[PDB]
Design a binder for this molecule. Structure first.
Ligand SMILES: Cc1cc(CC(=O)N2C[C@H](O)C[C@H]2C(=O)NCc2ccc(N(O)O)cc2)on1
Lengths: 86, 137, 102
């Protein structure tokens, strides 16, 4: 029902399995938990925000809002994004 | 060839820009060529004279990021309402976008990342490419 | 109306959603199913303020406007253990590098 996504700095993110399954990479690492030795907190908190954003707004006719990304965080998020295939 | 049909049967259309981007409407000629029209500021609407079976797509005026229209990629006037939306971009493409919009394209070389993310940045969204990816389907 | 939340204690973060009209207590029932600790042993917070069990999320300040999928509102969580209740402590996330060129 839920899985745990652990970051480089050991913050623990608990997210519905379905949401996490937005990442093909994570989909494969599963099928309990997953550790990400090279993804920091500040980045993985945004990824999980994306999974929930993705699952809410896909297949929607009622105007989607932008996904906001702070410039400070763009580069790392790009790398994580690329790795996780999402 | 993905082209407008030359029906000559008028068809009034409303373009509503339900997105935060400056939208650029694009009409595909009878010869298949993308023809750009005046830009739609974010949130605004515009009444348009088109024709039945004609073909339109919409893009971000500034960055050519693709957008959806009535949930799909192409809009064709019937007997009309054209609602223009952000797709749910992938988180990666979404990141490319912000990076692209923050960095002069000559300086992609200077950023600290895999060589393959350098080539992703350089591979700008583009109407001609999208027509090829849509012509195959 | 769905409300999108980040439930936070220590280095623990749960991503969940709830009806605006559901209660702080119902939320506790949800933390329970996840973190295996009965309501009983939990305090929920908005910012620093301690939330009352029978108050709805809307009434507590989580609305569609402030609790969005892409920008969830945070709910502070504290546990008891013995008999006392720990203090509310949420470890912040890591800092991003200073910007290159902008
Ligand atoms: C006959 C005949 C002529 C044409 C060319 C044409 O007039 N088109 C093609 C597209 O359906 C749109 C339509 C057109 O250009 N209408 C006038 C117009 C002027 C301004 C704008 N905007 O500024 O958005 C939109 C449409 O197609 N069949």
């Amino acid at each position: 029902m839920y899985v745990k996504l652990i970051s480089s700095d050991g913050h623990e993110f608990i997210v519905k399995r379905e949401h996490a399954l937005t990442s093909g990479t994570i989909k494969a690492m599963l099928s309990n938990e997953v550790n990400f030795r090279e993804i920091p907190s500040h980045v993985l908190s945004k990824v999980c925000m994306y999974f929930t954003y993705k699952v809410r707004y896909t297949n929607s006719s009622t105007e989607i809002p932008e996904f906001p990304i702070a410039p400070e965080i763009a580069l790392e998020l790009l790398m994580a994004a690329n790795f996780l295939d999402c | 060839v993905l082209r407008s049909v030359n029906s000559r049967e008028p068809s009034q259309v409303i373009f509503c820009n339900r997105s935060p981007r400056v939208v650029l409407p694009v009409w595909l000629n009878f010869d298949g060529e993308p023809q750009p029209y005046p830009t739609l500021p974010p949130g605004t609407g515009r009444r348009i004279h088109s024709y039945r079976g004609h073909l339109w797509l919409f893009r971000d005026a500034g960055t050519h990021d693709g957008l959806l229209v009535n949930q799909t990629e192409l809009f064709v006037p019937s007997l009309i309402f054209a609602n223009i939306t952000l797709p749910v971009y992938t988180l990666k493409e979404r990141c490319l976008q912000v990076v692209r919009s923050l960095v002069k394209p000559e300086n992609y070389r200077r950023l600290d990342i895999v060589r393959s993310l350098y080539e992703d940045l350089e591979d700008h969204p583009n109407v001609q490419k999208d027509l090829e990816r849509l012509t195959q389907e | 109306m769905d409300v999108f939340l980040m439930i936070r204690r220590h280095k623990t973060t749960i991503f969940t959603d709830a009806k605006e009209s559901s209660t702080v207590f119902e939320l506790k029932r949800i933390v329970e199913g996840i973190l295996k600790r009965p309501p009983d042993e939990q305090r929920l917070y908005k910012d620093d303020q301690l939330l009352d069990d029978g108050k709805t999320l809307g009434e507590c300040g989580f609305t569609s406007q402030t609790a969005r999928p892409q920008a969830p509102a945070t709910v502070g969580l504290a546990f008891r253990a013995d008999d006392t209740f720990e203090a509310l402590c949420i470890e912040p996330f890591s800092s991003p590098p200073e910007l290159p060129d902008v």
